[PDB]
Design a protein around this ligand. Structure first.
Ligand SMILES: *[C@@H]1O[C@H](CO)[C@@H](O[C@@H]2O[C@H](CO)[C@@H](O[C@H]3O[C@H](CO[C@@H]4O[C@H](CO)[C@@H](O)[C@H](O)[C@@H]4O)[C@@H](O)[C@H](O)[C@@H]3O)[C@H](O)[C@H]2NC(C)=O)[C@H](O)[C@H]1NC(C)=O
Ligand SMILES: [Zn+2]
Length: 696
């Protein structure tokens, strides 16, 4: 009558160190294991519960001192648990060692300890064994207390044919012959760590290596054919590793960082401590058959997995309910690190895009708070990255840097709740109470700004396409100073006084805050006038912020379409990628609707306007398949936009390129050839006004 019935393991028995021996046969796809887990009870008990999944356990025994009683083994496979029953109850404080011998088949499902395969350039098929334990698949490789807060140290021993090479979290300490044609690799004992980060690969990979200034041996491992494709990742890893050491003010905790390009990898990449694993796409760069657009994905993934080597692995979440923070921060560090290490890649453009996308989904009533209870690549992580960025810009960058450093130093090799980050952050503003508003309640606020002279009035309310209330960390700038000012809106309304009256004031500086800002009275006109007059006054992101917001407000009926379209008219002058994309994302769907309706003579004037608006930009765009990794996407979209739209210099050079390709994607071109209640309302309110507008 299985003696435990909670999903979570009992907290009164704690592992301290594991001795893992894994002998895995890659020919017969079978592995045998012995697991010695040293433990202590904080409370008397004759029952040890631990996790095990698809493992045939032969014998299990409990050592103390020096005795050695056998243990009765009970299985509850549906809960992925097993119980060990001890003849006598364990004494509190006394160390005991549990030894479990077991066998298992390598998984075919790309989870746990699994078989992956690859055909070499010279035809032969070769097998490799690899791990993926996040979140709960270490229990498929060896029985354990497989929850991330039961941290312990791992001595891993892998047995393989001389044919093969074994790598794991720590460096190889010694290789010894344990039998006829059986080598035993002895890996150095890990620092205290979580079970889900434990990794080992049994393979035939070759590799390349580079030392960091710090003295850390960084290596990328790949199948022998593609190991020449690893040079980019390696150089990136070292730079980022060096960057993070500096940022976190904590040396890389382990002695070596290995990156591995696992062939049939079904996750994207995993942050196994000391042995990060990636899909080949995400790490290797083929000089021929892959675009310079791949390099973004490699750098950013490395950035993410390396970030975890401190934030996630050195300091781990107590439970999966704070996975959002872990990943949010990794994602956020992608943006922070790469923008400094590989500035030429232009990660900024990618980041805010995803924040916008997060907002689009977060505005829907279906949305869920970021911080959910869990009792067992995603937008919640994206949101987490945004709110983290919002926080960082509110405090200084340096303040935020200090908070992370203190946090990491304080909780090293321990676990934490998300509140612990906010507490660290709040001691380098009630950060805890603030961030709770953003993590415990869904969506985000509309900030309504009303100016009377020097008195700047702030209202907040939940934005919806509830009685919700945030601690909004507002930042703003005025016509007077380019200096960023801060105001913490803890209440539904508040006011702040300026020293002197201003022509315009702009909230949500650099688009960094997870919220939208509306301006009552002539405030939008002030800002419309600012952009028309001198648009570089505010940043590119500010402009994008204004256009997005402007048109988004038109949707919820707090702004007349004309006022938004009037703002759009600034785009004549716009050079940068982020605003134009916002212009297009909001203007394009307008005419796409108008096509479906048979009042298609205004359609034509709209398209004329759209093309006349972007005309100047359409020209300056030179016809290469190569530039700033997103700037390419601008070229692509602009050129496509210009034709179908029958721009004359599109169809002057555009078909001259087609006759040059006549001398010696394909669905798109072969289709764009000339051979509902939300809508009904939109056009019902918006058609006439847009016509009356266009006319002028
Ligand atoms: C996975 O399981 C497989 C079987 O299902 C294993 O395979 C077999 O592995 C053995 C050795 O690992 C291999 O037999 C070898 O036998 C020779 C051993 O060498 C010695 O040399 C001297 C000869 O004068 C003497 O000391 C003694 O007689 C002995 O012969 C070796 O030299 C040969 O080259 C030969 O390879 C079998 O061939 C393998 N069988 C098959 C079908 O491949 C495999 O090792 C397992 N791997 C793991 C990790 O468990
Ligand atoms: Zn991650």
């Amino acid at each position: 009558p299985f003696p435990w019935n909670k999903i979570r393991l009992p907290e009164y028995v704690i592992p301290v160190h594991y001795d893992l021996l894994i002998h895995a046969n890659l020919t017969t796809l079978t592995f045998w294991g012995t697991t010695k887990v040293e433990i202590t009870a904080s409370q008397p008990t004759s029952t040890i519960i631990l996790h095990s999944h698809h493992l045939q356990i032969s014998r299990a025994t409990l050592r103390k001192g020096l005795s050695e009683e056998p243990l009765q083994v009970l299985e509850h496979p549906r809960q992925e648990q097993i119980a060990l029953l001890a003849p006598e109850p364990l004494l509190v404080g006394l160390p005991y060692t549990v030894v479990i011998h077991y066998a298992g088949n390598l998984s075919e499902t790309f989870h746990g300890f699994y078989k992956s395969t690859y055909r070499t350039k010279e035809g032969e098929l070769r097998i490799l064994a690899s791990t993926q334990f996040e979140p709960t698949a270490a229990r498929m490789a060896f029985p354990c207390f497989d929850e991330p807060a039961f941290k312990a140290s791992f001595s891993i021993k892998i047995r393989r044919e001389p044919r093969h090479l074994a790598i794991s979290n720590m460096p190889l300490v010694k290789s010894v012959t344990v039998a006829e044609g059986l080598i035993e690799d002895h890996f150095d004992v890990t620092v205290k760590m979580s079970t889900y980060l434990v990794a080992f690969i049994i393979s035939d990979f070759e590799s390349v290596s580079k030392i960091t200034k710090s003295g850390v041996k960084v290596s990328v491992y790949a199948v022998p054919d593609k190991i020449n494709q690893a040079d980019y990742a390696l150089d990136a890893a070292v730079t980022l590793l060096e960057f993070y050491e500096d940022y976190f003010s904590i040396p890389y905790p382990l002695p070596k960082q290995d990156l591995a390009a696992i062939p049939d990898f079904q996750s994207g990449a995993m942050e196994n401590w000391g042995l990060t694993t990636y899909r080949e796409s995400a790490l290797l760069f083929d000089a021929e058959k892959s675009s310079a657009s791949s390099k973004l994905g490699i750098t950013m993934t490395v950035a993410h997995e390396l970030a975890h080597q401190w934030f996630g692995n050195l300091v781990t979440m107590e439970w999966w309910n704070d996975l959002w923070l872990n990943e949010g921060f990794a994602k956020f560090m992608e943006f922070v690190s790469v923008s400094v290490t590989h500035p030429e890649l232009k990660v900024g453009d990618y980041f805010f895009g995803k924040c916008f996308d997060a907002m689009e989904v977060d505005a829907l009533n279906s949305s869920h708070p970021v911080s959910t209870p869990v009792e067992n690549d995603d937008v919640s992580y994206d949101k987490g990255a945004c709110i983290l960025n919002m926080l960082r810009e509110y405090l200084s960058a340096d303040a935020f840097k200090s908070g992370i450093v203190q946090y990491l130093q304080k909780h090293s090799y321990k676990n934490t709740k998300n509140e612990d980050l906010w507490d660290s952050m709040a001691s380098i503003v009630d950060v805890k109470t603030m961030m709770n508003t953003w993590t415990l309640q869904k969506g985000f606020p509309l900030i309504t700004i009303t100016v009377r002279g020097r008195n700047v009035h702030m209202k907040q309310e939940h934005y919806m396409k509830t009685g919700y209330l945030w601690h909004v960390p507002l930042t703003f700038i005025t016509s007077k100073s380019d200096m960023v000012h801060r105001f913490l809106l803890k209440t539904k309304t508040d006011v702040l006084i300026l020293p002197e009256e201003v022509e315009w004031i702009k909230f949500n500086v650099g688009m960094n805050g997870y919220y939208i800002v509306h301006y009552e009275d002539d405030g939008w006109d002030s800002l419309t006038g600012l952009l028309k007059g001198t648009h570089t006054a505010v940043s590119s992101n500010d402009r994008a912020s204004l256009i997005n917001n402007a048109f988004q407000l038109v949707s919820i009926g707090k702004l007349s379409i004309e006022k938004a379209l009037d703002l759009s008219l600034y785009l004549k002058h716009e050079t940068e990628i982020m605003p134009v994309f916002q212009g297009l994302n909001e203007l394009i769907p307008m005419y796409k609707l108008m096509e479906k309706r048979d009042m298609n003579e205004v359609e034509t004037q709209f398209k004329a306007f759209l093309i006349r608006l972007l005309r100047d930009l359409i020209d300056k765009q030179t016809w290469t398949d190569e530039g700033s990794v997103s700037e390419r996407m601008l070229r692509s979209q602009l050129l496509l936009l210009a034709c179908v739209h029958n721009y004359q210099p599109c169809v002057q050079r555009a078909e001259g390129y087609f006759r040059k390709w006549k001398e010696s994607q394909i669905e798109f071109a072969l289709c764009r050839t000339q051979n509902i209640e939300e809508n009904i309302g939109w056009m019902d309110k918006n058609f006439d006004k847009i016509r009356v507008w266009l006319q002028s």
